């Protein structure tokens, strides 16, 4: 029984919520709140532990970008602080290779990072790796063939359709085929050896379009669009299906959870979050 965890988010301000959805019985679990509210964070799992990486705490009285790394133990229902990153990273992308967390791009105030750093849970240490070829905030990160892909985002001036690839063994980045659509704040994940980029914002509108990268043909192909246009959505893969959680559609903060079936190329609404929010960190354990 694996659960879909949603951490933080934004609605009126940055949120502390930690909730877990059970796709089998359709139930929601209210877990221990994050010690610090955060939106624009990313979640990941290493060794059955959930990690909440970066983000920003938006409050009516002030905002603070986060360099924090926090660890949640499902067995104890406890958050424990870990070593912080070298810099705050709001609107971050995260990816796991060999139980090591890569924190990719994001912003700190006026600064749009191209820097990337890697966390080692065994040492509780962050180390900078080679920076990306492009500054990317609202970046989608996917791990495919033990390579770390950084997909779309925003560079401080322009929203990107470009994508690049990190080779951990060689410690280097290379540009790959650009997507068909410019996407900042999309849901990026890997399903059946493909990278999916669902939703996002193109500089004008929130998107419902979904495209997938096939490594063999090095091409991006459009698949069935989602029912809702959404940017700042949470995304995950559970039992061979894609789940998109919340986001912003240009008018409202969505509580909608859609599920993608690759066999039928269809999306369906599976549940609703307890409240609408955007900028959540999502992971499965
Ligand atoms: C104008 C604006 O963004 N404001 C004004 C001050 C607070 C901030 C706000 O409200 N941010 C939240 C949280 O967003 C995120 O965590 C996030 C995470 C990843 C990528 C991108 C985003 C942005 S999201 O794609 C754009 C969407 C929006 O345009 N409005 C609601 C008007 N904003 C949001 O949901
Ligand atoms: Cl924000």
PDB file of C-alpha atoms and ligand atoms in Angstrom:
ATOM      1  CA  UNK A   1       0.000   0.000   0.000  1.00  0.00           C
ATOM      2  CA  UNK A   2       1.819   3.089  -1.324  1.00  0.00           C
ATOM      3  CA  UNK A   3       0.360   6.575  -0.690  1.00  0.00           C
ATOM      4  CA  UNK A   4       0.469   9.833  -2.678  1.00  0.00           C
ATOM      5  CA  UNK A   5       1.818  12.548  -0.319  1.00  0.00           C
ATOM      6  CA  UNK A   6       1.136  16.249  -0.869  1.00  0.00           C
ATOM      7  CA  UNK A   7       3.289  18.706   1.141  1.00  0.00           C
ATOM      8  CA  UNK A   8       2.828  22.485   1.494  1.00  0.00           C
ATOM      9  CA  UNK A   9       1.205  24.540  -1.251  1.00  0.00           C
ATOM     10  CA  UNK A  10      -0.411  27.971  -1.617  1.00  0.00           C
ATOM     11  CA  UNK A  11      -3.959  29.312  -1.054  1.00  0.00           C
ATOM     12  CA  UNK A  12      -4.089  32.954   0.200  1.00  0.00           C
ATOM     13  CA  UNK A  13      -0.581  32.152   1.589  1.00  0.00           C
ATOM     14  CA  UNK A  14       1.974  29.328   1.794  1.00  0.00           C
ATOM     15  CA  UNK A  15       0.594  26.205   3.548  1.00  0.00           C
ATOM     16  CA  UNK A  16       1.879  23.651   6.134  1.00  0.00           C
ATOM     17  CA  UNK A  17      -0.385  20.753   5.056  1.00  0.00           C
ATOM     18  CA  UNK A  18       0.877  17.226   4.761  1.00  0.00           C
ATOM     19  CA  UNK A  19      -1.817  14.898   3.457  1.00  0.00           C
ATOM     20  CA  UNK A  20      -1.691  11.385   1.965  1.00  0.00           C
ATOM     21  CA  UNK A  21      -4.100   9.929  -0.581  1.00  0.00           C
ATOM     22  CA  UNK A  22      -4.764   6.225  -0.881  1.00  0.00           C
ATOM     23  CA  UNK A  23      -5.666   5.470  -4.561  1.00  0.00           C
ATOM     24  CA  UNK A  24      -7.066   2.026  -3.528  1.00  0.00           C
ATOM     25  CA  UNK A  25      -9.792   3.203  -1.073  1.00  0.00           C
ATOM     26  CA  UNK A  26      -9.924   6.899  -2.147  1.00  0.00           C
ATOM     27  CA  UNK A  27      -9.243   8.147   1.428  1.00  0.00           C
ATOM     28  CA  UNK A  28      -7.208  11.188   2.612  1.00  0.00           C
ATOM     29  CA  UNK A  29      -4.972  11.146   5.728  1.00  0.00           C
ATOM     30  CA  UNK A  30      -4.100  14.351   7.575  1.00  0.00           C
ATOM     31  CA  UNK A  31      -0.486  13.996   8.663  1.00  0.00           C
ATOM     32  CA  UNK A  32       1.818  16.185  10.746  1.00  0.00           C
ATOM     33  CA  UNK A  33       2.140  19.709   9.330  1.00  0.00           C
ATOM     34  CA  UNK A  34       5.444  21.008   7.941  1.00  0.00           C
ATOM     35  CA  UNK A  35       7.242  22.988  10.684  1.00  0.00           C
ATOM     36  CA  UNK A  36       7.524  25.927   8.172  1.00  0.00           C
ATOM     37  CA  UNK A  37       4.772  26.596   5.555  1.00  0.00           C
ATOM     38  CA  UNK A  38       5.989  26.362   1.953  1.00  0.00           C
ATOM     39  CA  UNK A  39       4.781  26.731  -1.665  1.00  0.00           C
ATOM     40  CA  UNK A  40       6.884  26.153  -4.762  1.00  0.00           C
ATOM     41  CA  UNK A  41       8.721  23.289  -2.976  1.00  0.00           C
ATOM     42  CA  UNK A  42       9.377  19.834  -4.377  1.00  0.00           C
ATOM     43  CA  UNK A  43       8.946  16.446  -2.747  1.00  0.00           C
ATOM     44  CA  UNK A  44      10.801  13.161  -3.188  1.00  0.00           C
ATOM     45  CA  UNK A  45      11.261   9.839  -1.380  1.00  0.00           C
ATOM     46  CA  UNK A  46      14.561   8.171  -0.373  1.00  0.00           C
ATOM     47  CA  UNK A  47      14.557   5.011   1.736  1.00  0.00           C
ATOM     48  CA  UNK A  48      10.850   5.299   2.609  1.00  0.00           C
ATOM     49  CA  UNK A  49      11.331   8.845   3.907  1.00  0.00           C
ATOM     50  CA  UNK A  50       9.612  11.825   2.312  1.00  0.00           C
ATOM     51  CA  UNK A  51      11.683  15.006   1.713  1.00  0.00           C
ATOM     52  CA  UNK A  52      10.348  18.544   1.304  1.00  0.00           C
ATOM     53  CA  UNK A  53      12.934  20.635  -0.591  1.00  0.00           C
ATOM     54  CA  UNK A  54      13.071  24.439  -0.890  1.00  0.00           C
ATOM     55  CA  UNK A  55      10.131  26.662  -1.764  1.00  0.00           C
ATOM     56  CA  UNK A  56       9.024  29.980  -0.219  1.00  0.00           C
ATOM     57  CA  UNK A  57       6.950  30.949   2.768  1.00  0.00           C
ATOM     58  CA  UNK A  58       4.443  33.596   1.623  1.00  0.00           C
ATOM     59  CA  UNK A  59       2.613  35.292   4.477  1.00  0.00           C
ATOM     60  CA  UNK A  60       0.476  38.491   4.393  1.00  0.00           C
ATOM     61  CA  UNK A  61       3.238  40.208   6.447  1.00  0.00           C
ATOM     62  CA  UNK A  62       6.285  39.012   4.518  1.00  0.00           C
ATOM     63  CA  UNK A  63       7.933  36.346   2.395  1.00  0.00           C
ATOM     64  CA  UNK A  64      11.012  34.150   2.903  1.00  0.00           C
ATOM     65  CA  UNK A  65      12.617  31.904   0.224  1.00  0.00           C
ATOM     66  CA  UNK A  66      13.692  28.544   1.629  1.00  0.00           C
ATOM     67  CA  UNK A  67      16.991  26.647   1.531  1.00  0.00           C
ATOM     68  CA  UNK A  68      15.441  24.041   3.881  1.00  0.00           C
ATOM     69  CA  UNK A  69      15.438  20.284   3.543  1.00  0.00           C
ATOM     70  CA  UNK A  70      13.007  18.467   5.795  1.00  0.00           C
ATOM     71  CA  UNK A  71      12.437  14.794   6.216  1.00  0.00           C
ATOM     72  CA  UNK A  72       9.129  13.082   7.082  1.00  0.00           C
ATOM     73  CA  UNK A  73       9.023   9.563   8.573  1.00  0.00           C
ATOM     74  CA  UNK A  74       5.651   7.926   7.829  1.00  0.00           C
ATOM     75  CA  UNK A  75       6.208   5.450  10.633  1.00  0.00           C
ATOM     76  CA  UNK A  76       6.632   8.147  13.331  1.00  0.00           C
ATOM     77  CA  UNK A  77       4.552  10.979  11.748  1.00  0.00           C
ATOM     78  CA  UNK A  78       7.471  13.322  12.425  1.00  0.00           C
ATOM     79  CA  UNK A  79       9.274  15.991  10.360  1.00  0.00           C
ATOM     80  CA  UNK A  80      13.018  16.317  11.085  1.00  0.00           C
ATOM     81  CA  UNK A  81      15.201  19.136   9.701  1.00  0.00           C
ATOM     82  CA  UNK A  82      18.155  18.148   7.521  1.00  0.00           C
ATOM     83  CA  UNK A  83      21.187  20.147   6.296  1.00  0.00           C
ATOM     84  CA  UNK A  84      19.955  23.203   4.300  1.00  0.00           C
ATOM     85  CA  UNK A  85      20.970  23.826   0.666  1.00  0.00           C
ATOM     86  CA  UNK A  86      23.773  26.322  -0.226  1.00  0.00           C
ATOM     87  CA  UNK A  87      21.062  28.796  -1.355  1.00  0.00           C
ATOM     88  CA  UNK A  88      17.267  29.267  -1.101  1.00  0.00           C
ATOM     89  CA  UNK A  89      15.420  27.767  -4.090  1.00  0.00           C
ATOM     90  CA  UNK A  90      11.815  28.809  -4.662  1.00  0.00           C
ATOM     91  CA  UNK A  91       9.889  27.145  -7.602  1.00  0.00           C
ATOM     92  CA  UNK A  92      12.518  24.276  -7.444  1.00  0.00           C
ATOM     93  CA  UNK A  93      12.736  20.972  -9.338  1.00  0.00           C
ATOM     94  CA  UNK A  94      13.942  17.776  -7.629  1.00  0.00           C
ATOM     95  CA  UNK A  95      15.128  14.344  -8.864  1.00  0.00           C
ATOM     96  CA  UNK A  96      16.582  11.219  -7.169  1.00  0.00           C
ATOM     97  CA  UNK A  97      19.495   9.136  -8.535  1.00  0.00           C
ATOM     98  CA  UNK A  98      20.939   6.381  -6.301  1.00  0.00           C
ATOM     99  CA  UNK A  99      19.268   7.682  -3.160  1.00  0.00           C
ATOM    100  CA  UNK A 100      20.761  11.185  -3.720  1.00  0.00           C
ATOM    101  CA  UNK A 101      18.495  14.212  -4.073  1.00  0.00           C
ATOM    102  CA  UNK A 102      19.284  16.749  -6.811  1.00  0.00           C
ATOM    103  CA  UNK A 103      17.901  20.284  -6.097  1.00  0.00           C
ATOM    104  CA  UNK A 104      17.656  22.009  -9.476  1.00  0.00           C
ATOM    105  CA  UNK A 105      17.455  25.745 -10.192  1.00  0.00           C
ATOM    106  CA  UNK A 106      14.732  27.796  -8.590  1.00  0.00           C
ATOM    107  CA  UNK A 107      14.909  31.445  -7.454  1.00  0.00           C
ATOM    108  CA  UNK A 108      16.163  33.448  -4.493  1.00  0.00           C
ATOM    109  CA  UNK A 109      14.648  36.922  -4.657  1.00  0.00           C
ATOM    110  CA  UNK A 110      15.969  38.543  -7.861  1.00  0.00           C
ATOM    111  CA  UNK A 111      18.305  35.580  -8.628  1.00  0.00           C
ATOM    112  CA  UNK A 112      17.237  32.823 -11.044  1.00  0.00           C
ATOM    113  CA  UNK A 113      19.547  29.856 -10.436  1.00  0.00           C
ATOM    114  CA  UNK A 114      21.254  27.690 -13.010  1.00  0.00           C
ATOM    115  CA  UNK A 115      23.028  26.007 -10.049  1.00  0.00           C
ATOM    116  CA  UNK A 116      22.356  22.393  -9.067  1.00  0.00           C
ATOM    117  CA  UNK A 117      23.249  20.620  -5.820  1.00  0.00           C
ATOM    118  CA  UNK A 118      23.107  17.009  -4.569  1.00  0.00           C
ATOM    119  CA  UNK A 119      22.186  15.799  -1.076  1.00  0.00           C
ATOM    120  CA  UNK A 120      23.599  12.630   0.471  1.00  0.00           C
ATOM    121  CA  UNK A 121      21.236  11.373   3.229  1.00  0.00           C
ATOM    122  CA  UNK A 122      23.971   9.095   4.612  1.00  0.00           C
ATOM    123  CA  UNK A 123      26.267  12.098   5.288  1.00  0.00           C
ATOM    124  CA  UNK A 124      23.524  14.802   5.712  1.00  0.00           C
ATOM    125  CA  UNK A 125      25.487  16.932   3.210  1.00  0.00           C
ATOM    126  CA  UNK A 126      24.836  19.038   0.127  1.00  0.00           C
ATOM    127  CA  UNK A 127      27.475  19.522  -2.566  1.00  0.00           C
ATOM    128  CA  UNK A 128      27.243  21.628  -5.683  1.00  0.00           C
ATOM    129  CA  UNK A 129      27.446  19.750  -8.999  1.00  0.00           C
ATOM    130  CA  UNK A 130      27.866  21.231 -12.527  1.00  0.00           C
ATOM    131  CA  UNK A 131      25.320  24.085 -13.077  1.00  0.00           C
ATOM    132  CA  UNK A 132      22.769  23.903 -15.909  1.00  0.00           C
ATOM    133  CA  UNK A 133      23.358  25.590 -19.266  1.00  0.00           C
ATOM    134  CA  UNK A 134      20.229  27.736 -18.561  1.00  0.00           C
ATOM    135  CA  UNK A 135      18.860  29.508 -15.436  1.00  0.00           C
ATOM    136  CA  UNK A 136      15.525  27.677 -14.684  1.00  0.00           C
ATOM    137  CA  UNK A 137      12.839  28.425 -12.061  1.00  0.00           C
ATOM    138  CA  UNK A 138       9.501  26.477 -12.225  1.00  0.00           C
ATOM    139  CA  UNK A 139      11.647  23.730 -13.747  1.00  0.00           C
ATOM    140  CA  UNK A 140      10.412  20.174 -14.284  1.00  0.00           C
ATOM    141  CA  UNK A 141      12.872  17.456 -13.301  1.00  0.00           C
ATOM    142  CA  UNK A 142      12.719  13.835 -14.392  1.00  0.00           C
ATOM    143  CA  UNK A 143      15.087  10.901 -13.877  1.00  0.00           C
ATOM    144  CA  UNK A 144      15.355   8.647 -16.906  1.00  0.00           C
ATOM    145  CA  UNK A 145      18.171   6.134 -17.715  1.00  0.00           C
ATOM    146  CA  UNK A 146      20.078   7.450 -14.622  1.00  0.00           C
ATOM    147  CA  UNK A 147      20.218  10.917 -16.301  1.00  0.00           C
ATOM    148  CA  UNK A 148      18.625  13.989 -14.754  1.00  0.00           C
ATOM    149  CA  UNK A 149      16.505  16.014 -17.152  1.00  0.00           C
ATOM    150  CA  UNK A 150      15.645  19.697 -16.461  1.00  0.00           C
ATOM    151  CA  UNK A 151      12.524  20.583 -18.511  1.00  0.00           C
ATOM    152  CA  UNK A 152      11.251  24.091 -19.290  1.00  0.00           C
ATOM    153  CA  UNK A 153      10.897  26.737 -16.638  1.00  0.00           C
ATOM    154  CA  UNK A 154      11.635  30.445 -16.525  1.00  0.00           C
ATOM    155  CA  UNK A 155      15.070  32.100 -16.847  1.00  0.00           C
ATOM    156  CA  UNK A 156      14.227  35.577 -15.447  1.00  0.00           C
ATOM    157  CA  UNK A 157      13.276  37.026 -18.846  1.00  0.00           C
ATOM    158  CA  UNK A 158      11.761  34.207 -20.936  1.00  0.00           C
ATOM    159  CA  UNK A 159       9.644  31.145 -20.326  1.00  0.00           C
ATOM    160  CA  UNK A 160      11.280  28.051 -21.759  1.00  0.00           C
ATOM    161  CA  UNK A 161      10.364  25.141 -24.005  1.00  0.00           C
ATOM    162  CA  UNK A 162      14.029  24.081 -23.877  1.00  0.00           C
ATOM    163  CA  UNK A 163      15.235  21.032 -21.944  1.00  0.00           C
ATOM    164  CA  UNK A 164      18.653  19.762 -20.893  1.00  0.00           C
ATOM    165  CA  UNK A 165      20.222  16.600 -19.605  1.00  0.00           C
ATOM    166  CA  UNK A 166      22.711  15.906 -16.755  1.00  0.00           C
ATOM    167  CA  UNK A 167      25.213  13.026 -16.957  1.00  0.00           C
ATOM    168  CA  UNK A 168      26.195  12.272 -13.277  1.00  0.00           C
ATOM    169  CA  UNK A 169      29.247  10.140 -14.195  1.00  0.00           C
ATOM    170  CA  UNK A 170      30.666  12.856 -16.432  1.00  0.00           C
ATOM    171  CA  UNK A 171      29.243  15.744 -14.299  1.00  0.00           C
ATOM    172  CA  UNK A 172      28.003  17.654 -17.351  1.00  0.00           C
ATOM    173  CA  UNK A 173      24.878  19.096 -18.977  1.00  0.00           C
ATOM    174  CA  UNK A 174      23.762  18.908 -22.652  1.00  0.00           C
ATOM    175  CA  UNK A 175      20.695  20.421 -24.362  1.00  0.00           C
ATOM    176  CA  UNK A 176      18.113  17.886 -25.618  1.00  0.00           C
ATOM    177  CA  UNK A 177      15.136  18.368 -28.056  1.00  0.00           C
ATOM    178  CA  UNK A 178      13.032  21.359 -26.953  1.00  0.00           C
ATOM    179  CA  UNK A 179       9.348  20.716 -26.154  1.00  0.00           C
ATOM    180  CA  UNK A 180       6.574  21.790 -28.581  1.00  0.00           C
ATOM    181  CA  UNK A 181       5.250  24.203 -25.899  1.00  0.00           C
ATOM    182  CA  UNK A 182       6.845  26.787 -23.598  1.00  0.00           C
ATOM    183  CA  UNK A 183       6.164  25.620 -20.021  1.00  0.00           C
ATOM    184  CA  UNK A 184       7.080  27.173 -16.671  1.00  0.00           C
ATOM    185  CA  UNK A 185       5.401  25.467 -13.668  1.00  0.00           C
ATOM    186  CA  UNK A 186       4.453  22.199 -15.422  1.00  0.00           C
ATOM    187  CA  UNK A 187       4.220  18.707 -13.935  1.00  0.00           C
ATOM    188  CA  UNK A 188       7.245  16.650 -15.120  1.00  0.00           C
ATOM    189  CA  UNK A 189       7.566  12.916 -14.346  1.00  0.00           C
ATOM    190  CA  UNK A 190       8.602   9.652 -16.030  1.00  0.00           C
ATOM    191  CA  UNK A 191       6.171   6.878 -16.977  1.00  0.00           C
ATOM    192  CA  UNK A 192       7.013   3.747 -19.068  1.00  0.00           C
ATOM    193  CA  UNK A 193      10.486   5.111 -20.181  1.00  0.00           C
ATOM    194  CA  UNK A 194       8.972   8.512 -21.266  1.00  0.00           C
ATOM    195  CA  UNK A 195       9.139  11.975 -19.787  1.00  0.00           C
ATOM    196  CA  UNK A 196       5.785  13.660 -19.513  1.00  0.00           C
ATOM    197  CA  UNK A 197       5.389  17.463 -19.275  1.00  0.00           C
ATOM    198  CA  UNK A 198       1.757  18.171 -18.224  1.00  0.00           C
ATOM    199  CA  UNK A 199       0.348  21.709 -17.992  1.00  0.00           C
ATOM    200  CA  UNK A 200       2.334  24.750 -16.988  1.00  0.00           C
ATOM    201  CA  UNK A 201       2.202  28.389 -18.145  1.00  0.00           C
ATOM    202  CA  UNK A 202       3.368  29.565 -21.610  1.00  0.00           C
ATOM    203  CA  UNK A 203       3.665  33.298 -20.822  1.00  0.00           C
ATOM    204  CA  UNK A 204       0.000  33.947 -21.767  1.00  0.00           C
ATOM    205  CA  UNK A 205      -2.173  31.032 -20.517  1.00  0.00           C
ATOM    206  CA  UNK A 206      -2.186  28.087 -18.067  1.00  0.00           C
ATOM    207  CA  UNK A 207      -2.023  24.850 -20.084  1.00  0.00           C
ATOM    208  CA  UNK A 208      -4.016  21.648 -20.195  1.00  0.00           C
ATOM    209  CA  UNK A 209      -1.815  20.151 -22.986  1.00  0.00           C
ATOM    210  CA  UNK A 210       0.468  17.190 -22.161  1.00  0.00           C
ATOM    211  CA  UNK A 211       3.507  16.099 -24.166  1.00  0.00           C
ATOM    212  CA  UNK A 212       5.888  13.153 -23.758  1.00  0.00           C
ATOM    213  CA  UNK A 213       9.558  12.727 -24.623  1.00  0.00           C
ATOM    214  CA  UNK A 214      10.598   9.478 -26.249  1.00  0.00           C
ATOM    215  CA  UNK A 215      14.355   8.979 -25.827  1.00  0.00           C
ATOM    216  CA  UNK A 216      14.785   6.622 -28.869  1.00  0.00           C
ATOM    217  CA  UNK A 217      13.213   9.068 -31.364  1.00  0.00           C
ATOM    218  CA  UNK A 218      14.331  12.200 -29.388  1.00  0.00           C
ATOM    219  CA  UNK A 219      10.863  13.689 -30.083  1.00  0.00           C
ATOM    220  CA  UNK A 220       8.171  15.370 -27.977  1.00  0.00           C
ATOM    221  CA  UNK A 221       4.621  14.150 -28.865  1.00  0.00           C
ATOM    222  CA  UNK A 222       1.298  15.495 -27.581  1.00  0.00           C
ATOM    223  CA  UNK A 223      -0.892  13.067 -25.672  1.00  0.00           C
ATOM    224  CA  UNK A 224      -4.482  13.602 -24.388  1.00  0.00           C
ATOM    225  CA  UNK A 225      -4.840  16.995 -22.638  1.00  0.00           C
ATOM    226  CA  UNK A 226      -6.049  17.250 -19.015  1.00  0.00           C
ATOM    227  CA  UNK A 227      -9.657  18.318 -18.225  1.00  0.00           C
ATOM    228  CA  UNK A 228      -8.247  21.360 -16.290  1.00  0.00           C
ATOM    229  CA  UNK A 229      -5.646  23.928 -17.405  1.00  0.00           C
ATOM    230  CA  UNK A 230      -3.107  24.019 -14.537  1.00  0.00           C
ATOM    231  CA  UNK A 231       0.240  25.606 -13.613  1.00  0.00           C
ATOM    232  CA  UNK A 232       2.054  24.961 -10.324  1.00  0.00           C
ATOM    233  CA  UNK A 233       0.518  21.452 -10.152  1.00  0.00           C
ATOM    234  CA  UNK A 234       1.925  18.562  -8.161  1.00  0.00           C
ATOM    235  CA  UNK A 235       2.675  15.418 -10.211  1.00  0.00           C
ATOM    236  CA  UNK A 236       3.449  11.784  -9.427  1.00  0.00           C
ATOM    237  CA  UNK A 237       3.298   8.242 -10.827  1.00  0.00           C
ATOM    238  CA  UNK A 238       1.478   5.491  -8.953  1.00  0.00           C
ATOM    239  CA  UNK A 239       0.890   1.962 -10.282  1.00  0.00           C
ATOM    240  CA  UNK A 240       1.598   2.813 -13.945  1.00  0.00           C
ATOM    241  CA  UNK A 241      -0.628   5.954 -14.016  1.00  0.00           C
ATOM    242  CA  UNK A 242       0.132   9.717 -13.766  1.00  0.00           C
ATOM    243  CA  UNK A 243      -1.578  11.761 -11.030  1.00  0.00           C
ATOM    244  CA  UNK A 244      -1.747  15.599 -11.253  1.00  0.00           C
ATOM    245  CA  UNK A 245      -2.692  17.407  -7.997  1.00  0.00           C
ATOM    246  CA  UNK A 246      -4.072  20.904  -7.685  1.00  0.00           C
ATOM    247  CA  UNK A 247      -2.516  23.914  -9.347  1.00  0.00           C
ATOM    248  CA  UNK A 248      -3.833  27.256 -10.637  1.00  0.00           C
ATOM    249  CA  UNK A 249      -6.100  27.475 -13.767  1.00  0.00           C
ATOM    250  CA  UNK A 250      -5.950  31.274 -14.235  1.00  0.00           C
ATOM    251  CA  UNK A 251      -8.982  31.883 -11.975  1.00  0.00           C
ATOM    252  CA  UNK A 252      -9.081  29.354  -9.154  1.00  0.00           C
ATOM    253  CA  UNK A 253      -6.791  27.176  -6.980  1.00  0.00           C
ATOM    254  CA  UNK A 254      -7.722  23.636  -7.949  1.00  0.00           C
ATOM    255  CA  UNK A 255      -8.611  20.813  -5.579  1.00  0.00           C
ATOM    256  CA  UNK A 256      -8.953  18.546  -8.657  1.00  0.00           C
ATOM    257  CA  UNK A 257      -6.844  15.381  -8.917  1.00  0.00           C
ATOM    258  CA  UNK A 258      -6.693  13.888 -12.422  1.00  0.00           C
ATOM    259  CA  UNK A 259      -5.325  10.506 -13.352  1.00  0.00           C
ATOM    260  CA  UNK A 260      -3.748   9.573 -16.732  1.00  0.00           C
ATOM    261  CA  UNK A 261      -4.025   6.013 -18.099  1.00  0.00           C
ATOM    262  CA  UNK A 262      -1.314   5.455 -20.764  1.00  0.00           C
ATOM    263  CA  UNK A 263      -3.073   2.287 -22.134  1.00  0.00           C
ATOM    264  CA  UNK A 264      -6.221   4.277 -23.069  1.00  0.00           C
ATOM    265  CA  UNK A 265      -4.600   7.780 -23.430  1.00  0.00           C
ATOM    266  CA  UNK A 266      -7.327   9.263 -21.180  1.00  0.00           C
ATOM    267  CA  UNK A 267      -7.504  11.453 -18.106  1.00  0.00           C
ATOM    268  CA  UNK A 268     -10.187  11.081 -15.423  1.00  0.00           C
ATOM    269  CA  UNK A 269     -10.903  12.956 -12.194  1.00  0.00           C
ATOM    270  CA  UNK A 270     -10.129  10.493  -9.325  1.00  0.00           C
ATOM    271  CA  UNK A 271     -10.488  12.621  -6.177  1.00  0.00           C
ATOM    272  CA  UNK A 272     -10.392  16.138  -4.850  1.00  0.00           C
ATOM    273  CA  UNK A 273      -7.898  17.446  -2.319  1.00  0.00           C
ATOM    274  CA  UNK A 274      -9.400  18.565   1.033  1.00  0.00           C
ATOM    275  CA  UNK A 275      -8.903  22.193  -0.217  1.00  0.00           C
ATOM    276  CA  UNK A 276      -7.685  23.819  -3.443  1.00  0.00           C
ATOM    277  CA  UNK A 277      -4.022  24.808  -3.617  1.00  0.00           C
ATOM    278  CA  UNK A 278      -1.087  25.257  -6.012  1.00  0.00           C
ATOM    279  CA  UNK A 279       2.696  24.846  -5.598  1.00  0.00           C
ATOM    280  CA  UNK A 280       2.602  21.557  -3.681  1.00  0.00           C
ATOM    281  CA  UNK A 281       5.451  19.054  -3.322  1.00  0.00           C
ATOM    282  CA  UNK A 282       4.306  15.499  -4.208  1.00  0.00           C
ATOM    283  CA  UNK A 283       5.876  12.028  -3.729  1.00  0.00           C
ATOM    284  CA  UNK A 284       4.793   8.326  -3.431  1.00  0.00           C
ATOM    285  CA  UNK A 285       5.866   5.879  -0.660  1.00  0.00           C
TER     286      UNK A 285
HETATM  287  C1  LIG B   1       1.003  36.342  -9.116  1.00  0.00           C
HETATM  288  C2  LIG B   1       1.491  35.213  -8.256  1.00  0.00           C
HETATM  289  O1  LIG B   1       1.848  34.138  -8.734  1.00  0.00           O
HETATM  290  N1  LIG B   1       1.471  35.506  -6.897  1.00  0.00           N
HETATM  291  C3  LIG B   1       1.392  36.857  -6.324  1.00  0.00           C
HETATM  292  C4  LIG B   1       2.071  36.774  -4.964  1.00  0.00           C
HETATM  293  C5  LIG B   1       1.951  35.304  -4.564  1.00  0.00           C
HETATM  294  C6  LIG B   1       2.006  34.571  -5.905  1.00  0.00           C
HETATM  295  C7  LIG B   1       1.030  33.444  -5.946  1.00  0.00           C
HETATM  296  O2  LIG B   1      -0.180  33.614  -5.863  1.00  0.00           O
HETATM  297  N2  LIG B   1       1.684  32.254  -6.171  1.00  0.00           N
HETATM  298  C8  LIG B   1       0.956  31.020  -6.088  1.00  0.00           C
HETATM  299  C9  LIG B   1       1.901  29.887  -5.712  1.00  0.00           C
HETATM  300  O3  LIG B   1       2.560  29.345  -6.866  1.00  0.00           O
HETATM  301  C10 LIG B   1       3.552  28.433  -6.735  1.00  0.00           C
HETATM  302  O4  LIG B   1       3.799  27.792  -5.721  1.00  0.00           O
HETATM  303  C11 LIG B   1       4.271  28.209  -8.015  1.00  0.00           C
HETATM  304  C12 LIG B   1       5.110  27.071  -7.969  1.00  0.00           C
HETATM  305  C13 LIG B   1       5.788  26.632  -9.111  1.00  0.00           C
HETATM  306  C14 LIG B   1       5.708  27.347 -10.311  1.00  0.00           C
HETATM  307  C15 LIG B   1       4.915  28.501 -10.345  1.00  0.00           C
HETATM  308  C16 LIG B   1       4.158  28.956  -9.234  1.00  0.00           C
HETATM  309  C17 LIG B   1       3.286  30.167  -9.541  1.00  0.00           C
HETATM  310  S1  LIG B   1       1.659  29.658 -10.265  1.00  0.00           S
HETATM  311  O5  LIG B   1       1.837  28.933 -11.567  1.00  0.00           O
HETATM  312  C18 LIG B   1       0.913  31.261 -10.740  1.00  0.00           C
HETATM  313  C19 LIG B   1      -0.210  31.662  -9.790  1.00  0.00           C
HETATM  314  C20 LIG B   1      -0.876  32.947 -10.227  1.00  0.00           C
HETATM  315  O6  LIG B   1      -0.621  33.413 -11.324  1.00  0.00           O
HETATM  316  N3  LIG B   1      -1.821  33.546  -9.387  1.00  0.00           N
HETATM  317  C21 LIG B   1      -2.468  32.866  -8.280  1.00  0.00           C
HETATM  318  C22 LIG B   1      -2.397  34.827  -9.760  1.00  0.00           C
HETATM  319  N4  LIG B   1       0.259  31.782  -8.406  1.00  0.00           N
HETATM  320  C23 LIG B   1       0.200  30.810  -7.411  1.00  0.00           C
HETATM  321  O7  LIG B   1      -0.469  29.803  -7.576  1.00  0.00           O
HETATM  322 CL1  LIG B   2       5.248  31.965  -5.465  1.00  0.00          CL
END
